[PDB]
């Protein structure tokens, strides 16, 4: 949950803060967190399940790092970031939907969907950051 929340928070912050013309000092930590997430998720295969009419979806992550070395973010930077963010946001939304439709009588506080169970592995703990909600 903390890893899933951190993915969603990173994507929301990227959408809000990675905007054309903004200073890199406004996104430096955000860009570092985004690249950490990209590195952690790269090479991992995920599947959001077919419970009910929810479609079976397969997710693959092979993305380049967001660039540094821009004093002010330009349109190319925002375009690349938007492509990556859109794919990640679709993945996160589908994972959240897959988890929202599942329940267990015992251990109902634990993740139910396979995607969230995979995200609960230690290797993804790096993605975790500010849990403020």
Partner 1 sequence: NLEELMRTGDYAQITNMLLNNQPVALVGALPFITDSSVISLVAKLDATV
Q: Residues in the site for its own copies, rule: CB under 8 A?
A: 2, 12-13, 15-17, 19-23, 25-26, 28-29, 32-33, 36, 72, 75, 82-83, 105-110, 122, 125-132
Handedness of CA 56, 65, 117, 14 (dihedral sign): negative
- Selection from partner 1, its own copies, none that 8 binds (CB < 5 to 8 A by kind) is none
Identify the residue whose tokens are 């169970």.
Answer: 117
- Selection from partner 1, its own copies, none that 23 binds (CB < 5 to 8 A by kind) is its own copies
Query: Distances from the Cα of 13 to the Cαs of 21, 57, 114, in angstroms?
Result: 16, 25, 26
CA distance 30 to 107: 34
Q: Closest distance between partner 1 and the C-beta of residue 41, in Å?
A: 12
Please list every residue from 21 through 60 that binds partner 1, using CB under 8 A.
35, 38-39, 42-43
Is 65 near partner 1 (CB under 8 A)?
yes
Q: Closest distance between partner 1 and the C-beta of residue 89, in Å?
A: 21
Q: What b-and-e string marks burial along 15-49, b requiring 16 or more CB atoms within 10 Å of the CB?
A: eebbeeebebeebeebbebbbbbbebbeeeebbbb
Closer CB to partner 1, 8 or 32, in the complex:
32
Residues engaged in binding partner 1 (CB under 8 A):
35, 38-39, 42-43, 64-65, 67-68
């Amino acid at each position: 949950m903390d890893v899933l929340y951190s993915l969603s928070k990173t994507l929301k912050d990227a959408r809000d803060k990675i905007v054309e013309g903004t200073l890199y000092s406004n996104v430096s930590d955000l860009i570092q967190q985004f690249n950490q997430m990209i590195i952690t998720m790269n090479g991992n295969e995920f599947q959001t399940g077919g419970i009910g009419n929810l479609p079976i979806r397969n997710w693959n992550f092979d993305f380049g790092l967001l660039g540094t070395t821009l004093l002010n973010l330009d349109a190319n930077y925002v375009e690349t970031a938007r492509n990556t963010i859109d794919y990640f946001v679709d993945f996160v939304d589908n994972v959240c939907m897959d988890e929202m439709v599942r329940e267990s009588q015992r251990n109902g506080i634990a993740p139910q969907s396979d995607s969230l169970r995979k995200l609960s592995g230690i290797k993804f703990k790096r993605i975790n950051f500010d849990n403020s909600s």
